[PDB]
Amino acid sequence: TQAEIKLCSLLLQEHFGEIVEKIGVHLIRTGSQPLRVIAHDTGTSLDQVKKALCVLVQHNLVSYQVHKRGVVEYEAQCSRVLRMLRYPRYIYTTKTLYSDTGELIVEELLLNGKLTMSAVVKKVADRLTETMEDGKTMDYAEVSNTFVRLADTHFVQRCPSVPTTENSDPGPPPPAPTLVINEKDMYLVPKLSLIGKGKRRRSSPIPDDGIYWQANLDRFHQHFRDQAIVSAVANRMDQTSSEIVRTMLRMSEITTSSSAPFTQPLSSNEIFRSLPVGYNISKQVLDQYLTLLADDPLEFVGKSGDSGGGMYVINLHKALASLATATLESVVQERFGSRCARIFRLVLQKKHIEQKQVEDFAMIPAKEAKDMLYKMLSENFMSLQEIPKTPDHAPSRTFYLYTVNILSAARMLLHRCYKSIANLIERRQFETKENKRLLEKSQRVEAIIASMQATGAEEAQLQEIEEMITAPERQQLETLKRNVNKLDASEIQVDETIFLLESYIECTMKRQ
Template sequence: MTQAEARLCSLLLQEHFGEIVDRVGQYIIRTGSQPLRIIAKDTGTSLDQVKKALCVLIQHNLVSYQMHKRGFVEYTAHCDRCLRMLRYPRYIYTAKTLYGDTGELIIEELLLNGKMTLTAVVKKVADRLTETMEDGKSMEYSDVSTTFSQLADTHFVQRCPALQDEESTTPTEGRRPPVPTLVTNEKEMYTVPRVVMIGRGKRRRSSDEDEGASQSKRAKRDQETSSQDDGIYWQINTERFHQHFRDQAIISAVSNKMDQTSSEIVRTMLRMSEITTSSQAAHTHPLSSNEIFRALPKGFNISKQVLDQYLALLADDPLEFVGRSGDSGGGMFVINLHKAVATLATCNLESIVQERFGSRCARIFRLLLRKRHLEQKQVEDFAMIPAKEAKEMLYKMLSVNLIALQEIPKTPDHAPSRTFYLYTVNPLPAARMLLQRCYKTVANLIERRQFETKENKRLLEKSQRIEAIIASMQATGAEEAQLQEIEEMITAPERQQLENLKRNVNKLDASELQVDDTIFILEAFISSTKARV
C-alpha cells in the first residue's frame, strides 16, 4: 500500500460514505488488521459509531473480518476494492449500454447498497422505473426479474459467498462468533432462484392514508415473496466488468490498427469465450474457423473465404492479438489476452513519454523497446539524433525511471573504461511507477473538484432553492411571468459563475474517467505479468 493509494482511498471513502466511515476505513488501511476496541480508541470515535461504520464497510465488501487465534475479531480493509469505487460510473454506463435502463438501475442499486436480495432489487428498480413512465403506466416485476436473470447469466452479477454459520454474519464484541467459513460453489454463484413475483412498480402517493394502505399491501406481498428468496444476497461481479473493459480495449485497438471487419471478427471470438474463459487466462479457448463463421452477426455479410483471409491476416499481424493453435475445423484460433494487454500498456507508456518529453524521446523509447539493450552511441545512430541531444534525453528519462541503465563489466574490478553501459526499458517497473502517478493525479482531481464546489457552495444552494421553487410553481400551474420573475433572482454574473463552475466540474469529471482508463490498462498489465510469473 503506497501513500498515493491510501490518499485516494481516503478521498473515495469520504466522498461516498462521509467523514466517520473515512476515518475508520483509513485507520484500518494504514495499520492493517485491528480489533474493534483498538479502532475506537485510536480513532477517537465512540464504539457505537465505529460499529456502524464497520457495518457500512462490510456491507459494501470493503472490509472483512476473521477470528484471531486469541479469541477476538479482527477487521481487515481491502484497498483494491476501495479503489474500484472510482469505476462505479463506468460499471453503471456499461450496464445501460448492454441492458438498457433496467440493467442500469439494477447495477446502480447494487452499488448503492453493497448487496441486496433479488426481490428487494426488483421492487426498488420497478418503482423507480414506474416513476419515470408517463400515461399512468407501471413497470412489471417480471420484466425487471428477466433483466436481472440476463445479468446473472452473463456473470455481471453474482451471489454473495454464503457463510457456513449464519450467526457469524453479524459479529459483535460481546461474544465470540465462530470463524466464518465461506461456501463458494461456482455453479450456484450465477443461478437465479425461481421467485414468483406478481405485481407492478408503485408510484409515490401524497396522501398519508393512501401511503399507509400501500405500505400494508406491500408488507403483505413482501412476506409472501421473502420465503422464496431464501436470504440469497447478490452483488456485482467487478471481475466480469473488468473483463468486458479489457475486451472493448482489444476490439478498439484492432479497429484502429486494421479495419471495422477485423474488429467485428475479434469481437465475435471474445463474445464466444466471455463466459468460459477466466479473467486471468493467458488466452481464450481455441475456436475453429467454422465456429467463428456461424457465430458472426446476421447482418455481417462476409463469405467463409473472406473470413479465412481476415483470420490469416490477424494471425500474421505483428501485434499477435490473434494466434493459431491448430489446423482442425478450418483452423483453430485464440485471442492472446496477456499479449494484447501488454501491447496496450506499452502503447500507453509510449504515449505518456511523447506527451511529457516530446516526439524525439518517444522515438528513443520505442527504439529501446524494440532493440532491448543499446549503448548510447547506438541510440544516437539508430534514432538519428545528435549526440548531445540524445544524451540529454536519455538522462532525462533515466532520472524519472522510465528507462534503466545496465552495467556489464569486462573485468571484475568494474572499471568504467572496461564496462559496457546499456540502456533498456523495463515495462513492468515503468508501469508501476506511472500507476502511482495516476493515483496521485486522480486524488488531485477529486480535491480540486471538492474545492471548486466548496468555494461556490452559497451560489449552488441558492440555485437549488430557486429550481425547487420553480418546480413547485410549475406543478401548481403558475403563470409564465411569475416563473420568469423567480428566475431573475439569479443575476447575470451569478449565472455566468454557475456556467463556469459546471464547465470546470465537467472537465474534472472527464479527466478522472480518462485517467481511470489508463489506470485500468496498467493494472491489467501488472496483474497479467504476475500471473505469467
C-alpha cells in the same frame, strides 16, 4: 501506496462521509485488526466504529475473518475501493449491452452493495414508474427476466451465503458466522412467483430472504479488456478483424476463466458458423483473415493446432502487453514530443543500446537525443544496465546500456495516474468549497421558485429572482459548473488508463 491511500480517502469522504472514511483509511494503512484496537487507535466512540464497519462491509469494501481465541479481524480491500471509481463506466456498459432496466439494476446493486432479488426488482420498478407516464405500470416479470439475463452472463453474482447453523455445528453461536462461497448457486436466481406494480411516489415473508446479490466486477473487467482488444485490432487492420476477434472472445468468455495465458482454441468452422450473418464473408475469407492475424508481429492470435481445419487461439497476455506498450509510448509522446517517442520506441525494440547507436539509428543530432534520454532517466521511464568491466564499478571503466522495463514503468505510470486523479478530486473539492457561498445563494434563490410551485403560485415571484445580485454571479456559476464538468470528465477518462495498467500488472504476476 500513499497515493492509493489518498485516493481511497478522497473517495470514501466524497461517497460515505467522515467518521467512516477515517476507519477505512485506518484499515487500509494498518491491515487486519480487531475492532477494539481499531476503536482505540482511531479515537472515536465504539458505536461509530461499529456503524462504519457495518456500512463498509455492506458495500463489500471490508471483510471479517476468524482467528485464534475466536477473535474477529477486519481487513479492507483497497482494490475494491479503487474499483468503486469505475461505477459510471459499469453503468454505461450495462446500459449499452442491455436495456435501461439492467442499467437501473446495476445502479442499485452498486449503490447498495448487497440486496435481494425481490428488493432490487421492486426498486427498479419504482424508479422506472417515474420514467413513463399515462398510467402505465411496471411489472416484475420483465425486470426478473432482465435480472436473470444479467445473471447467466455472469454480470451479477450471488454474495457469499452463511452456512446453515442447525446443520453446521448446532450449539453455541460463533462470534462470526464464517460466510463461505459456493459456486453451485453462484448464478442461480430464486423462483419468485410474486409480482407487483411500482408506485408513482404518491406518498399517500420474503421468499428470497438470505440470498444477496452484487455486481461481478471481474466480468466487467473482462468485457472492458475485450472491448479494448477489439478497438485496438480495429485501429490496426480493419473492422472485419475486429468483428472476428469479437466473436472469438464472445465464444471464449464462457469456456475460459479470468486469468489464463492462453484461451481455449477455436476452429475455423465454429467461428464461421457463430459469426453474425450480416457479413457476406465466406470460409476462405475467414481462413485468410485468421492466417494473416497469426502472422501479425503483435501476436494477437496464434495457431496452436492444425486439427479441425483452421485451429486458432487468442493471446490475451500478449495483447495486454501490447496495449500497455501503446499506452506508455503514447504518454511519452504527449509528455516529451514525437522525437522522444521515437527514441523510446528505438530503445524498446532494441533491448540494449547506447547513445551513439541511438543517434545512428534514430537520426537525431547530438546535444538533443542525450537530453531526452536523461529526461526519461529522471522520470524512471528506463533503467541503465551498467555492465562493469571490474567489480569496482567505476564510471570511467564501464559501459552504460539503456533498457526500458515495461513492468516498473507501468507501475510508475499507475502511481502517477492515481496521484493525478487524487489531485483532480482535490481541485474539484476546493472549487466547490471556495464557492459554497454562491452555491447556497443560488440554491436559496432557486428554491424560492421550487417552493409553492403550483399551490398559491402567483406570477409576482418570477420577475424578482434575477433582480438580486446573483445575475452578475451567474457567470462565475457557469465557470464553476464547466470546470467541475471538465474535471469529472478527465477523472473518468484517466480511469481507462488506470484499468489498462492494472490489468497489465495483474496478468503478469503468478501469485505463487
